[PDB]
Amino acid sequence: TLRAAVFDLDGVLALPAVFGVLGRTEEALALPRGLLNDAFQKGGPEGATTRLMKGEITLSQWIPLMEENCRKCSETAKVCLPKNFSIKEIFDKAISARKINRPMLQAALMLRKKGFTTAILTNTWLDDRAERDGLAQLMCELKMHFDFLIESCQVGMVKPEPQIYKFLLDTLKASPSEVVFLDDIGANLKPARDLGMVTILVQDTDTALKELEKVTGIQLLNTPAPLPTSCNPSDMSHGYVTVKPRVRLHFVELGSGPAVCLCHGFPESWYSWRYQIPALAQAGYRVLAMDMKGYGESSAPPEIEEYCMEVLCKEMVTFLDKLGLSQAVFIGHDWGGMLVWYMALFYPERVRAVASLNTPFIPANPNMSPLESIKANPVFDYQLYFQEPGVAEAELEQNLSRTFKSLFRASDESVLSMHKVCEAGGLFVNSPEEPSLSRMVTEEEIQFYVQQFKKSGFRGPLNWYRNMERNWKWACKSLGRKILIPALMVTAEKDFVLVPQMSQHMEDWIPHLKRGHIEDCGHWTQMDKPTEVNQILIKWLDSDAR
Amino acid sequence: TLRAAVFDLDGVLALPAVFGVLGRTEEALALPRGLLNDAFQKGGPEGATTRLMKGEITLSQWIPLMEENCRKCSETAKVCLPKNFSIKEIFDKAISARKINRPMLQAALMLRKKGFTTAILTNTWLDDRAERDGLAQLMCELKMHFDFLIESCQVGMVKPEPQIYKFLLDTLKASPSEVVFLDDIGANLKPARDLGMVTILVQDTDTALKELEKVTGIQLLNTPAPLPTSCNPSDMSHGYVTVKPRVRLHFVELGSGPAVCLCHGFPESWYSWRYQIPALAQAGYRVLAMDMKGYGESSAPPEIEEYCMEVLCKEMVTFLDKLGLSQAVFIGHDWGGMLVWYMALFYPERVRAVASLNTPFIPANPNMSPLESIKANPVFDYQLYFQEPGVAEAELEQNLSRTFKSLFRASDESVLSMHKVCEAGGLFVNSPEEPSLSRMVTEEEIQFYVQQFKKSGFRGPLNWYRNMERNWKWACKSLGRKILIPALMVTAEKDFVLVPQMSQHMEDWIPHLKRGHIEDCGHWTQMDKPTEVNQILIKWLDSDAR
């Protein structure tokens, strides 16, 4: 019974196969059929290509040896190679053209999710070309999804030598009968078959995947659209910056490129961005997912005033100062969305671009108390419940699992009503003791939030709501300004608190505002509709943030 | 008696003054003298410029108001503004032309080092221009060197209003007679004088600095060349990546741009790069200064084999994988320099460029044991002393302060001889109990190393020397390769262990190798000659790493 699946890189996990470029080059240059592929494999186990694939020599050292093999082959075939024939050019083009075979990676992802040990076994080289980064990026993206990556040039062994197959089995800690091995080269498949491994000759992906699902008993073809890659907290780079003597900010960091600072809402975590972190890094950005002040590994002082927008914003500027960042794109959700509009208003030189999920920009009404404003909206009743220090902390801290299971629900699953929360005397008074698990979250993901909130509880987070008068007075200083930097407003159809219509007058303050809108999406945008959030943010980033 | 120095930005800490561009524009466009400066100050306290400087409006909102003031002024002067007259263009150019007045910053640096509280008090704006990053970078660089930055647009107050001066004094916690205030605008200097502050009207920097040194009693002019900016450990962003279950790597992170991974030697710290970290970040790079395996906040497992080059290198690849970095430029010193050549040899796709300070690349001799090789060089005797587990740990751990004070010495201060270390029975047998403090280090810097080494001691670090046979066998696999990626070798004249001549045959293995050489420099390159290390690395980075 199968418990491991092994995949080749070229022609299996990555297409088009670099081998298929040699044939295409022969046809384009009208050279004898097989001339390039014959020069490539010249001398077999003793040849330059085996030396390259075993790691004896680098790609740049191999290029002239391949050129000499091509001359020798053309001489024997009684033909002439063109005026400007370049092996470097041929391979640079072949390599950049090669992309991830997405349905093959999806099938590998599915087998791994169903308990399989997965591995990439590849005949590859030590790439020292000026353009080696392209392949490095490809390998980096692919490898993360597998338990093992075995590279011929690293192990000093090559397919079809029997030793690499015995090395594979030892790495897998599996008997051959427990392994599926997928390869586009029949000769390289032969030693796995001979050992008793289930083998699949990959020509077209669909047939290979049909053979793969038939042999594993797991649905791989026609499966529903998978979720984006998530984050394993223990596999991330964790960052810590002290912004003032008693205040330290924690963040998760992934990728290279323009800095993108992710700001969560209430009562959340850097982990609320788990589905965006790998996607935005893969899209060419340096992601900084914050644990906002009062949360997770960030400091949580008890004083209410430590959580007014003016201080939160100043500390975010200090956070950039200490990291040596002149700018970052600021992306916020909920309370983070509010902070992000205020960063754009008070510190535009530090904000490359601004984006908010659900939270609109509504300027302070100078002719009305923020208390009056909040009272005027029935859905904002829970904010008055949040005012008295200790009351909401006691209910929210009593049972952590219940708190998150009750809150983190899709629009069709709601167990909470935000109206008459004060009158009812609590957020969970008409909510079950043991709520069911929402389709948006696993039990483990709820438990990460439970463990985070065991450190400081709900005092710091609730203090974000306890600065109405302070925030209002500070916001009034910005009443003559406009937001003229790149800005994106993302509304969620079914957010019954931060309704899409609350954002209707934003172009009066943000004339060049760009928009996104997510249908059938509740308040928990990032986990509700991760695929669509990623698409909206990446499209806006590549066009407006660079 | 003076204890605080206050500096203006425009025309004081930054030159040329943006005000002086309006006059230059008038002259270039042959407009009436003062037309632009008169339109700029139009309406005085009630005018658009005061609104901008107080933060009521942003720079982009102000541009058309300045245009209307220019039209009004030209109308009164009975003149016409040119065909393509643009305030945006004028200010974009003015702002990008403005650079830090280096001798003024040096004097501020010196006063602060001598115990003064320093501050920048500026009439500035909320910059939301597409090109606002240039100024953000300038402010970011300047602010780090001062105790306070007071910006008119942030405090809703402007010079010469008396309230900003009272705000300044309150921020300083100083009586006016204790303050020196430097400004290029006599009108803005007047309220400070009236309060009893010592004032300096800044025209040329030299005269201002002459007045400043006369009044403070501190040498500011003709002073020796200062050291580069160092790092305060508590003001840095600290990063942590788990590379395998029992192994976590710590790093300090500063800047944006191409990733530059700094690798220290024995027995050092990320802190050995303190003088390079701010310089390389300022030069346009994302610096990652490691605590190498066995050191500081990085894990230090006891097993010798955990420290062979093969595992150290693989973990550095995993470090890049987890941070989401397809590449980094690798810069090493001493044992870090050795690791860095091996990264280039075994993982060229992951190494953007490679640089080593002092450590040459010498390939394994396949016809000789590494023990034989080390025995053949008398200066390498101490490495045989390092072999026996426990012996060097006991001497190096006995007195930490003595260990670092004895080791970290300039070429003209040496207290240690690396020959006959085994025969003598120790590294410090002919060394004092209380060594004098080297000119390279302060007592506090020695104490940071003492505190770091209290965590894991010398076992992990000494284990870097205990893998000769393992490293040799692994290095032999690379004997047919060449290093063909961008590479830099930096030799130190007076390093009597890693002598410049040990690097003489490197072009046989690295044909395109670039070189740097530091005269009168011992083994501790980074702290011995920080200014010259920075110049060599930055020049090579900008040309070969991008």
Ligand SMILES: CNC(=O)NC1CCCCC1
């Ligand atoms: C639970 N959501 C919530 O209270 N969000 C607030 C964000 C700031 C604006 C008011 C609502």
Ligand SMILES: CNC(=O)NC1CCCCC1
């Ligand atoms: C104290 N320096 C030291 O032992 N450095 C080593 C680096 C690796 C090559 C041999 C010397």
